[PDB]
Design a protein around this ligand. Structure first.
Ligand SMILES: Nc1nc2c(ncn2[C@@H]2O[C@H](COP(=O)(O)OP(=O)(O)CP(=O)(O)O)[C@@H](O)[C@H]2O)c(=O)[nH]1
Lengths: 205, 498, 82, 85
RNA sequence: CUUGCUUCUUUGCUGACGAGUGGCGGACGGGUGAGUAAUGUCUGGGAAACUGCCUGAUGGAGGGGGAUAACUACUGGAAACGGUAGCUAAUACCGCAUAACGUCGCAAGACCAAAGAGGGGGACCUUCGGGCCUCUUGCCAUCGGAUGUGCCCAGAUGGGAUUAGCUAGUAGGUGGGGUAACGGCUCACCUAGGCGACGAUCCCUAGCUGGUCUGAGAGGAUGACCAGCCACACUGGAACUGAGACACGGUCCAGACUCCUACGGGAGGCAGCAGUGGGGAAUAUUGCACAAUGGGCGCAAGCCUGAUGCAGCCAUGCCGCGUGUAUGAAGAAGGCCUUCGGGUUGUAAAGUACUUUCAGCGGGGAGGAAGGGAGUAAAGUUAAUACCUUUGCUCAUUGACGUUACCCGCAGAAGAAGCACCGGCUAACUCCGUGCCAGCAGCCGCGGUAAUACGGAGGGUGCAAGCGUUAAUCGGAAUUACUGGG
């Protein structure tokens, strides 16, 4: 299910920083970004409409770590909701439990947050959840159980949380590692760069 | 004085081993008369509707290429019936059967057959037995003269003189009884000089032999003989009293811990053969069992020890006069037949929680004959199933090379006409006429442990072949390749599986 | 003969009984006249464990429906003074 | 078929004479009244109707006749015997 | 003889019960769509109806008789399977008295039924079998209610005109018989009508529907699994019991097939659950138990249930997780390309620091379970503190799944990643070996010696325990156009 491979080659393949190598260290410049996705990355592609749609889809997916069948299920769930599909799809992507653990700073990267969810450490509302695809309901409280609390891996990776934007729709305690979930995020708050319109155009045909 | 052990004592075992062309089938068909119930490719079990006791039989093919079955079914049978012909004499067959039977010290009653044909002098035959077997004997009777003149039986320890009538092979008839030994009317009815020669030979028996024993009969040091023919319906009629009076209770058998007696529980019915069954609608493969320890229950749940599983088996077929009878329970000391589908191999032990094994499986190494080439190549699935169905047996093991053609038939014997005749059944329709292709020596079975056989597969992946039961030994071509396999060092706990 | 009985719906290892009025010659999941209430045996303490409309049940008692043992136990569970 | 519940076969054999024999004698009495319809004697028709009425009402009571067949017999046969009389 | 520690012949006397008669169930549950183009199904109505078991109301439950199985004795047959001579019981069978709003008749009038068992006991009477007193249960007749079933009408439910006239009990009427009942349902007589271009008769195909897939919608195919109806149980036909079958595990006959035999004669129908053969490209285990529901019988305790609740196999389909994470340039080794400067594989790997999801093992541990049994306090009933119904209350308890779900602990990143594609459609590049040979391909198509198209290597892309191919339906196809063409 998981990719577990060259997580920084994907950032060169899409060109933008996918935050798969976020880590303790800052922006690396150790892989020759934007100019070498692979062996023949010096070529300039024709880059058509289906091309930019597929690149946008794979970009958003390798940001969020969702497979294709699962993301198609998220699109089918976002299609039946109210409002517009593009906001609802990104709200369902943000409603994943491992994404909430990543936004809290409980882990440097997203794979570390998914591993922390998977290893019986992340507990919401007093009930431990192992599946990273847990749809986080509004007005919940997420924390770490006492038998898995602060074995240093949450600790230094929390310092990365002092360098992030620290968004509005969730609050962390940072004294006992007890987060608090709140209302759903607005479209004009999450990362300001990704395009939902190409994903809607790809999954509409 | 419970009747349970009193009818355990009424259960006796006599399988029947002999020469080729000796008369197994005739004497079994005529013992079926005595209880009111190529050559030799079958095994038959007869429980009996007998009056006094209930003494089981178990037939086996007697040859050198055959009788691979009897190495593990003489372990089931406490006693031993030898049948030796006078024209055959003491041959390498009897030496092989005595090398089998001396390992467990079985009580042996011998029976000289073929009294209608020519038989040599009795003292010469007994001296040949006592010389080429190095085991003495105690004769009781001797019939009349030579050739076709054998028309009587003269007991010594019973003092009974019976006469013979010819042509009684179809119906059971009774001949009148003469009690006296020095009766001149017997000399007039039989012949004076022949009876005087018989009395002189009985005096030579009394002056040149020993008497019967009971504690030495258990080990089998002095084996008694019995005479008479299998066709005249006369000589085997006296066998039943000896079968009742001489054979003891069935002995305990050795396990890894100790011997399990016939008064205990936790049924020790392990499977001996997986014999080539005839298939009307189902297979069942066979289940011959050692149920000597423990009285049957209709709703008993057996325990597979080697896989450690609780298996509910309520249906058990009994071999009443050869026909597979209805669902019946009995008294311990019998041999069953169950309904298995490719689950139980040879020698799979059974208890009710005693997780130990026996010391059996006397099976040997095969000699790989030629091939399967699939003549009339349509519908290959009958041999891809039905001979792999026969691959679980000790005689037949079908081997599969990787290239999906040229499947190897593995026989321990030489005569593979058994499988060729067995290819003419309801689910068997391929001929496969044989030729000469050389495969040298038995595919010595060995499978390595983990983290070691992966590179063994990856180095010579074109030099493997699937086996009966999903095994991969090396490949059988020569002794030099087996030396390279020994040089390859497959360090593993060794399992023979043969 | 009409009767009020359970129907055993649900998933594997997840029972969910349907108390329902049906003829005795019908199947368990078969034909029924009308459904009334439900029962969930795995409905340990939460917002809802058992609904049971006693008006239609009393109407079928007035017609002659034979009450089974589990339905009578649910009647003794939905008590008039408790 | 080999079945423990084969008793309902031969018991129905035990029925198929006796009950039917009653049906037999019943219909003969009915046919007797038709003889009176072919006779023209209204007194003999009334006597035959009074003879057949209690046995056909008894066979309507014993489950053989379903109490509307015998009522139809009484109806149309009474109509015939008072149309003749 | 340890005169009580056991053996022994009689004894239904108790708990219970093989076989037999009888009552109920077997017409439900389970399986298949062979036949059927309307005698089937769906939608909407209707009267000329039935209805055991469920339940309401009103009365009776009074009085008698004769057989039979089982059994006794003999006998034919190996068995299967009976015969002869006798005996008996019932809630089995059949009469007799009576009977009403029941049946017939305009009325007068006539006719129709049964069966008793089990628990406990005060007085009286006991030939001491018991009558009697009470409770529970069962039976008969009628009127109802519900359920289910029988019957009729309208509409709707494929193709073919290379299917154009069909029908003679046919269409209608009168009268007789028959069904719980109208009804040519069935017979006697009379007329020539009835259907049909709005597709009558004939051929092929097809179970029908709620629904499923696709499609914005209209439509097209399908209806296998869930559920309702219909038809069927080797094929055809026919009847009996029973309220309900013109009958899967009931009967007979005609035909085919299999098996036993002592050869005189019999037994059988897996389109039930498992399982076997043949066919196919294709589909499983000759498993556990009534622990829960439901069905059958019993007042109850108890018995059966291959329906069901499950267990085993198959990536067959869906869903979720893991096969590590952070750091880590000498930008190591090997492979590939090159202009031989170097680049790619590549933060990938090695090293270091942590973690153990899921599997392995060892320990705790719910819920699916309501009940039922013994007993106590007792409200009703009655003469009764006795029997029986019901409610609290005390105790031993009822699990195949099941070494359960779930939780805790131990060892070690430790056991767990493949498949297609890379000329355009359509997401992604080079080198080498042949050279219209070998080969790929869904269409246009490449390969004729410098192939982004064959094979191999490197690399990338896409999907993920699945990936490609093949097969069917729909969309794109406004290329079946009523929406929406000429
Ligand atoms: N006249 C006569 N012939 C006999 C007698 N016993 C055996 N035979 C003959 O010897 C031969 C043996 O036949 P068979 O019974 O098949 O031998 P077998 O012992 O079964 C063979 P195997 O040991 O392999 O099982 C036959 O030809 C048979 O007629 C006997 O007592 N009398």
């Amino acid at each position: 299910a998981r990719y577990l491979g060259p997580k920084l080659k994907l950032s060169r393949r899409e060109g933008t920083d996918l935050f798969l190598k976020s880590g303790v260290r800052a922006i690396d410049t150790k892989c020759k970004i934007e100019q070498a996705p692979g062996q023949h990355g010096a070529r300039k592609p024709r880059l058509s409409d289906y091309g930019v749609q597929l690149r946008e889809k794979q970009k958003v997916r390798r940001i969020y770590g969702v497979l294709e069948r699962q993301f198609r299920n998220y699109y089918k769930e976002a299609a039946r909701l109210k409002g517009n599909t593009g906001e609802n799809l990104l709200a369902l992507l943000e409603g994943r439990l491992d994404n909430v653990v990543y936004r809290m700073g409980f882990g440097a990267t997203r794979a570390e947050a998914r591993q922390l969810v998977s290893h019986k450490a992340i507990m919401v509302n007093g009930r431990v959840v192992n599946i990273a695809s847990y749809q986080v309901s509004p007005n919940d409280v997420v924390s770490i159980r006492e038998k898995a609390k602060k074995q240093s891996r949450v600790k230094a990776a929390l310092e990365l949380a002092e360098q992030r934007e620290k968004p509005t729709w969730l609050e962390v305690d940072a004294g006992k590692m007890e987060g608090t979930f709140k209302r759903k995020p607005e479209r004009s708050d999450l990362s300001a760069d990704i395009n939902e319109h190409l994903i809607v155009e790809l999954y509409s045909k | 004085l419970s009747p349970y052990l009193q009818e355990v004592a009424k259960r006796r075992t006599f399988a029947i081993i002999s020469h080729p062309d000796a008369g197994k089938t005739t004497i079994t068909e005529k013992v079926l008369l005595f209880g009111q119930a190529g050559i030799s490719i079958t095994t038959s079990v007869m429980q009996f509707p007998y009056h006094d006791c209930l003494v089981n039989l178990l037939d086996t093919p007697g040859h050198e290429d055959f009788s691979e079955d009897t190495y593990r079914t003489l372990t089931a049978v406490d006693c031993c019936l030898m049948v030796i012909d006078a024209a055959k004499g003491v041959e390498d067959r009897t030496r092989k059967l005595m090398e089998v039977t001396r390992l467990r010290d079985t009580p042996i009653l011998t029976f000289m057959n073929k009294l209608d044909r020519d038989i040599r002098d009795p003292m010469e035959l007994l001296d040949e037995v006592e010389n080429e077997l190095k085991i003495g004997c105690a004769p009781i009777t001797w019939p009349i003269g030579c050739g076709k003149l054998f028309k009587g039986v003269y007991h010594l320890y019973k003092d009974e003189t019976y006469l013979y009538q010819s042509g009684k092979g179809h119906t059971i008839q009774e001949v009148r009884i003469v009690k006296g030994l020095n009766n001149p009317d017997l000399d007039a009815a039989v012949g004076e000089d022949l009876a005087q020669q018989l009395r002189d030979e009985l005096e030579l028996v009394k002056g040149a032999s020993n008497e019967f024993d009971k504690e030495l009969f258990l080990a089998g040091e002095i084996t008694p003989v019995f005479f008479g023919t299998a066709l005249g319906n006369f000589g085997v009629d006296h066998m039943l009293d000896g079968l009742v009076e001489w054979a003891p209770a069935p002995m305990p058998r050795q396990t890894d811990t100790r011997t399990v007696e016939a008064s205990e529980d936790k049924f020790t019915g392990f499977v001996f053969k997986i014999q080539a069954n005839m298939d009307p609608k189902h297979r069942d493969r066979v289940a011959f069992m050692r149920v000597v320890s423990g009285k049957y229950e209709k709703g008993m749940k057996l325990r597979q020890v080697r896989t450690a599983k609780d298996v509910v088996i309520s249906d058990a077929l009994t071999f009443m006069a050869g026909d597979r009878s209805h669902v019946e329970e009995a008294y311990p000391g019998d041999i069953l037949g169950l309904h298995n589908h490719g689950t139980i191999q040879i020698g799979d032990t059974f208890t009710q929680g005693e997780m130990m094994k026996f010391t059996g499986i006397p099976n040997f190494a095969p000699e790989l004959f030629r091939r399967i080439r699939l003549k009339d190549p349509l519908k290959q699935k009958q041999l891809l199933k039905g001979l792999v169905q026969l691959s679980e047996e000790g005689a037949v093991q079908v081997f599969r090379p990787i290239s999906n053609n040229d499947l190897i038939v593995g026989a321990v014997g030489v005569l593979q006409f058994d499988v060729v005749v067995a290819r003419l059944k309801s689910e068997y329709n391929v001929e496969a006429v044989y030729e000469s292709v050389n495969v040298a020596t038995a595919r010595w079975v060995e499978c390595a442990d983990a983290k070691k056989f992966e590179e063994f597969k990856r180095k010579n992946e074109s030099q493997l072949a699937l086996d009966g039961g999903d095994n991969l030994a090396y490949i059988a071509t020569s002794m030099v390749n087996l030396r390279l396999a020994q040089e390859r060092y497959p360090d593993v706990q060794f399992h023979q599986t043969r | 003969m009409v009767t009020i009985r359970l129907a055993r719906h649900g998933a594997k290892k997840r029972p969910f009984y349907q108390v329902v009025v049906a003829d005795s010659r019908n199947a368990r999941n078969g034909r029924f006249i009308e459904r009334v209430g439900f029962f969930n045996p795995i409905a340990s303490e939460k917002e809802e464990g058992t609904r049971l409309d006693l008006d239609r049940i009393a109407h079928w008692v007035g017609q002659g429906a034979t009450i089974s043992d589990r339905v009578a136990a649910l009647i003794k569970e939905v008590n008039k003074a408790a | 078929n080999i079945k423990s519940a084969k008793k309902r076969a031969i018991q129905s054999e035990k029925a198929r004479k006796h009950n039917a024999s009653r049906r037999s004698m019943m219909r003969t009495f009915i046919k007797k009244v038709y003889a009176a319809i072919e006779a023209g004697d209204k007194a003999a028709a009334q006597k035959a109707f009074n003879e057949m009425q209690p046995i056909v009402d008894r066979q309507a009571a014993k489950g053989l006749i379903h109490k509307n067949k015998a009522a139809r017999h009484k109806a149309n046969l009474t109509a015939q015997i008072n149309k003749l009389a």
